[PDB]
Write a protein that holds these residues in place. Structure first.
Motif, short mmCIF file in Angstrom:
data_model
loop_
_atom_site.label_atom_id
_atom_site.label_comp_id
_atom_site.label_asym_id
_atom_site.label_seq_id
_atom_site.Cartn_x
_atom_site.Cartn_y
_atom_site.Cartn_z
N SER B 286 12.52 -4.70 -1.35
CA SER B 286 11.08 -4.89 -0.71
C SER B 286 11.06 -4.43 0.72
O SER B 286 11.24 -4.08 1.55
CB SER B 286 11.42 -6.77 -0.99
OG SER B 286 11.76 -6.58 -2.78
N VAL B 287 10.06 -5.15 0.59
CA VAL B 287 9.71 -5.17 2.05
C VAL B 287 9.03 -6.77 2.92
O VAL B 287 8.92 -7.59 2.59
CB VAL B 287 7.98 -4.59 2.37
CG1 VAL B 287 7.47 -4.21 3.80
CG2 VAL B 287 8.37 -2.85 1.88
N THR B 312 8.30 -11.99 0.87
CA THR B 312 9.17 -10.97 0.94
C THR B 312 7.67 -10.31 0.00
O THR B 312 7.11 -11.15 -0.73
CB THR B 312 10.65 -11.02 -0.24
OG1 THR B 312 11.22 -11.14 0.72
CG2 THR B 312 10.89 -10.33 -0.91
N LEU B 313 7.29 -9.04 0.05
CA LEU B 313 6.30 -8.73 -0.95
C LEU B 313 6.74 -7.22 -1.35
O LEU B 313 8.37 -7.04 -0.75
CB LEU B 313 5.09 -7.77 -0.08
CG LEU B 313 4.56 -8.95 0.66
CD1 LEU B 313 3.42 -7.96 1.65
CD2 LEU B 313 4.07 -9.86 0.18
N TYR B 329 -0.66 -2.07 -6.37
CA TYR B 329 -0.27 -3.35 -5.09
C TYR B 329 -2.61 -3.46 -4.98
O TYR B 329 -3.29 -2.76 -4.61
CB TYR B 329 -0.37 -3.43 -3.89
CG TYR B 329 0.24 -4.67 -3.39
CD1 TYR B 329 -0.47 -4.53 -2.23
CD2 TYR B 329 0.96 -5.62 -3.87
CE1 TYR B 329 -0.63 -5.48 -1.52
CE2 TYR B 329 1.42 -6.26 -2.45
CZ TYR B 329 0.18 -6.77 -2.20
OH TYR B 329 0.42 -8.04 -1.29
N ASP B 330 -3.01 -4.36 -5.16
CA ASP B 330 -4.10 -4.96 -4.98
C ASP B 330 -4.33 -5.68 -3.46
O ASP B 330 -3.74 -6.66 -3.15
CB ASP B 330 -4.86 -6.28 -6.19
CG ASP B 330 -5.87 -7.08 -5.91
OD1 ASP B 330 -7.11 -5.54 -5.88
OD2 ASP B 330 -6.20 -8.20 -6.00
N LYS B 332 -6.03 -6.77 0.24
CA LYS B 332 -6.25 -8.05 0.64
C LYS B 332 -6.93 -7.68 1.50
O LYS B 332 -6.77 -6.88 2.98
CB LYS B 332 -4.85 -8.84 0.97
CG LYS B 332 -4.13 -9.25 -0.52
CD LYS B 332 -3.64 -10.75 -0.25
CE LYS B 332 -4.05 -11.91 -0.25
NZ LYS B 332 -5.40 -12.07 -1.73
N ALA B 428 -9.73 -12.97 0.09
CA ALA B 428 -9.76 -12.44 -1.42
C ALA B 428 -8.91 -10.74 -1.23
O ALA B 428 -7.70 -10.71 -0.57
CB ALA B 428 -11.27 -11.84 -1.54
N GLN B 432 -10.60 -8.44 -6.06
CA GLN B 432 -11.50 -9.77 -6.38
C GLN B 432 -12.52 -9.32 -5.88
O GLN B 432 -13.35 -9.98 -6.65
CB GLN B 432 -10.97 -10.73 -5.65
CG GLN B 432 -11.08 -11.89 -5.57
CD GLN B 432 -9.81 -13.44 -5.25
OE1 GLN B 432 -9.21 -12.84 -4.43
NE2 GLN B 432 -10.60 -14.01 -5.08
#
Lengths: 444, 444, 444
Positions: B286-287, B312-313, B329-330, B332, B428, B432
């Motif tokens: 992960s990152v 953790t992302l 990945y959305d 942000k 958001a 979104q």
């Protein structure tokens, strides 16, 4: 001690009860004084190591007096224009500057080292004399320094003068690096002997005296020292001590965590978080609420807080813990689409909000994994558990024994249709999300 | 060292690469002990300057023992219920309070000053004896103080006792002003000699030992000292040192700045800012993401961070740097209408967001202005440039040499029709804002 | 001094005028040096208390040199990528590392203790020699330590060496606990004697010299000390002092508080708050705006600020105080439904926002309650008033005399129809609430 905790599966929150209040509402001020001598030039040939050694320790003295002279010549948004913590101290400094006011203090302390003095603005202050550098320098030192040939007898006088001068230099450097105001209260500013003596003669109850003198370290963390005046052979500064006008009322801590719908794909989920986390204490028919972290210090089951850092809410606010949809208090929440995994360590346990592919578990150092958390908002008690892992991060549960209770119920996020959910409310409430939805549903 | 940086004209962001991780994941604890003597009353007529001088240095000793006795009797929202940094230390303090546990430590240190001890809760700790005030006061001092006539021979003993006592008073005042817990780790709490000795015997790799002992100043900034117990002629406190369980994985820093349409009149423009700025390190598939400022300390091309401060992302998060519209990945973002000019100083350069009538330039101290920034979001490398001016404010670029790269592309704000742009999104994301626009366009 | 304050009933804000600017725009650097000696091993049988006593004070010396060696080997969102405060200092450290550069400094200070030196990067620096530990240790000490039998004559030499060494250890512990950079500027780093001497020889006006030397305590709070180099028998560190390039322009402070409709029931009310609170100073045809709390320090009617902490706005921004609906600057506000009672303490008074059942009053310690605040946003002058109570919280008004003025007008919240009021705007403005309402009214 007798601490209990409830977790509400429906609103992803937890309440730690069993605590008892000690909220600062008053301030006590006393005047600490050090007796000075105004020695200017000492006509003295030196070079002899002993004389040159005491002349530079005398230089430290004049440098500190000068440095003190340079000082004396001159929900969280709702808590920003709060004013000065030290107003009642500053009020006492203004008075010591009046003519003859310092003279009143000197005469009260001419015969003893602790005395009550009635100031000219009506406040009765307790006054301490903690160091008499005047009569040391003038008597046991200055005669040797006022003939043209200056020979100090023994090195013991050099060391004795460093010990006398030492506390003055410790007090001056603290005021120097802090612009004349210091917190917490140094042992150098007020020793434990002087602080207990001061607490014992305070105009407060034997209840409050016993509470303060059992937690002197906390009293220090909530007190201020204010540099005041330096004239007429006297150094004086004001110590400002707390008065806990609220004692032994129930306090409880609210822990919140994001509650979200449980689809693994990011962004296609709606979230909802109670924003009213913090400390709550009952206080004069209302509830004092402390939204800021580290404005309350806990000792066993006692909460010390400063009401300057609080908001007053109607006592109905606690209904949000047991019935968030109640019609007596509009409970406050925020909404988003940010389903990031996270854990909150509560008093007697841990809240875990697990979303997406994240690995969230609760472990025992000897037994291994004891609970693997599913997606959604769940809770674990600290019995038999040492750590909580969320992704790559290790959190340590508190190790205090208490009564845990898990109140099952449906996550309220499931009640909301995602096609008409206001999903970016910074600071809303339950009925504000309802009336915002009622508009969209009528647009149809 | 080999540091490179890319600026993305399309999303007004910059990524500094080339760094290598050192993330704290474990804690090491050791027990530091000072040997005390429990001297109460010394029946001694004094007044002689030398005896009175050593009696007050003895008073400082008892005052510090007492003060220590008083201590022993008692994206950023996702990081608030994190728990206690010092849990594994506190776990060791609980054990030293068990009966005979301090006795185990004493016997292990009776013959040497450094020894491994197996505690009763399973943790094997390294134990140090850094000061033996017991056998000094009892042997080389107390005999002189226990006849009715007390005459110290020479002033050398007064000075020798101040030097022995001195470190104890330095340790006590730090614990006093900090409620028994201090960070960073004082040289007084642990000298460089003792700290390197401790690092050398840690259960860690020769890799981690060499990393720690090359950056002792950083280890201090990430360690804690915890005051523990004061009984049975022993003072003991726990030092808690970091363990870097993540080493040499790639780290990169994201810099963001507001991206807006470029009409000079205020408020008639729409803005858009990536909110995911901070540090990112690869960590176990992960990152690890560090959103808070000053939770990571850089040394050349090494990043030290504490994973307690991270989220953790999924590793896909870095796709936002190269393709913000990606479907894995959305990404942000936030939106607003606040076109205020501002600059971000990156690792190897500067981002400038110039709006309205503001004067934004980049200068060389000898050559003058080298770039005048137009309205919009632009970027300059630190080669040949010393300062950036934005309005009346002067920013200083970093002076480290690296590889800069400018990735041209169209500002994504230009893709949005301002008549249907949700222009006040606190938290958001790309899709979104898309689904919020898809509603407005169907209302038509 | 001549301070005046206006309260605007219509926008629930207050402006304190009468202040005068002192904004830091430049940095001055000077190099402080301590002369060292590189004493390694002293072949000396000891055990004699006096020799063993001076050997350990010599040990403190080598430990500090080593510790310094370890250091030398290695609206608020708009203010986060601001860069390094100490860039111009670090620029001077890079130069002292060049070959022979430290040698230039030594020769300039061989004959005196204060000298101007032209560095190799063009900056002319003032250089100070504040301690000559070299020639003390080499001359008046080391001969005694370099025969096989070492007998110090008198204890006076032990004490003389502690006094010489003392300032070096004070400087080293500050750099130790702060990773080589310290603020404010210690008296230990720069004494008042040396700091006034430095200010007097600065390349600045006699105006700026008199401003700085009248507020040395403020100059300390805005200066940095940077540990630099330790080679060739010299310790050197850089002091970085502010330069106030903006002086005596008008400054004013904006105080804001939530403005809401006055129905007692919670949540059924709409609120509105000006978000542009903080300090404003005129600065080169624009207005420097300081949104962060505690980035400006007041002394009488003088405001010291650091422009690194500011934003530049068009001077039209002040039109929001007198006409919030003006068409020259779009005034910035936020909206909500959070009617919680709160008070703001202004320069010469207090703003009170009273909502719901809360008890809000203003008192005199001798006379009792002087004003009971109705629901809504009201204001009281500090004349004849000591405290303001809001719920259970006591706020202390400032006690400075000035001119107060109450500008009556209708609360602008009354102009908005609550059925079409965007009631959760995090960061909007007047015309952004207007255009958001114009959409809803056309949907009808």
């Amino acid at each position: 001690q007798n601490i209990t905790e409830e977790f509400y599966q429906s609103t992803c929150s937890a309440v730690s009860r069993g605590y008892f209040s000690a909220l600062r509402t008053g301030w006590y001020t006393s005047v600490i004084t050090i007796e000075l001598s105004n020695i200017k030039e000492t006509k003295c040939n030196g070079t002899d190591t002993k004389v040159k050694l005491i002349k530079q320790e005398l230089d430290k003295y004049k440098n500190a007096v000068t440095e003190l002279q340079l000082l004396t010549q001159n929900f969280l948004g709702f808590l920003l224009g709060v004013g000065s913590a030290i107003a009642s101290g500053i009020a006492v400094c203004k008075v010591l500057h009046l003519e003859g006011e310092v003279n009143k203090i000197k005469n009260a302390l001419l015969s003893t080292n602790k005395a009550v003095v009635s100031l000219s603005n009506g406040v009765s202050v307790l006054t301490f004399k903690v160091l008499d550098l005047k009569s040391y320098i003038n008597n046991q030192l200055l005669p040797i320094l006022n003939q043209q040939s200056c020979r100090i007898s023994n090195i013991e006088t050099v060391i004795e003068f460093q010990q006398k001068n030492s506390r003055l230099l410790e007090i001056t450097r603290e005021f120097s690096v802090n612009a004349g105001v210091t917190t917490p209260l140094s042992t150098y500013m007020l020793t434990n002997s002087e602080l207990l003596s001061l607490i014992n003669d305070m105009p407060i109850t034997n209840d409050q005296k016993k509470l303060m003198s059992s937690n002197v370290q906390i009293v220090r963390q909530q007190s201020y020292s204010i540099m005041c005046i330096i004239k007429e052979e006297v150094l004086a500064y004001v110590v400002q001590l707390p008065i806990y006008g609220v004692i032994d009322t129930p306090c409880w801590k609210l822990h919140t965590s994001p509650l979200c719908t449980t689809n693994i794909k990011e962004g296609s989920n709606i979230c909802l978080t109670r924003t009213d986390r913090g400390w709550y204490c009952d206080n004069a028919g209302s509830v004092s609420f402390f939204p800021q972290a580290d404005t309350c210090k806990v000792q066993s089951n006692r909460v010390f807080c400063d009401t300057m850092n609080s908001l007053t809410l109607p006592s109905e606010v606690s209904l949000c813990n047991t019935d968030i949809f109640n019609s007596k208090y509009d409970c406050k929440i925020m909404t988003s689409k940010t389903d990031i995994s996270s854990s909150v360590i509560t008093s007697l346990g841990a809240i875990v909000s697990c979303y997406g592919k994240t690995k969230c578990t609760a472990s025992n150092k000897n037994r291994g994994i004891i609970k693997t958390f599913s997606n959604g908002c769940d809770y674990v008690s600290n019995k038999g558990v040492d750590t909580v892992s969320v992704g790559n991060t290790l959190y340590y549960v508190n190790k205090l024994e208490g009564k845990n209770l898990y109140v099952k119920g449906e996550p309220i996020i499931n009640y909301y249709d995602p096609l008409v959910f206001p999903s970016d409310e910074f600071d809303a409430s339950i009925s504000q999300v309802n009336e915002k939805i009622n508009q969209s549903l009528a647009f149809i």
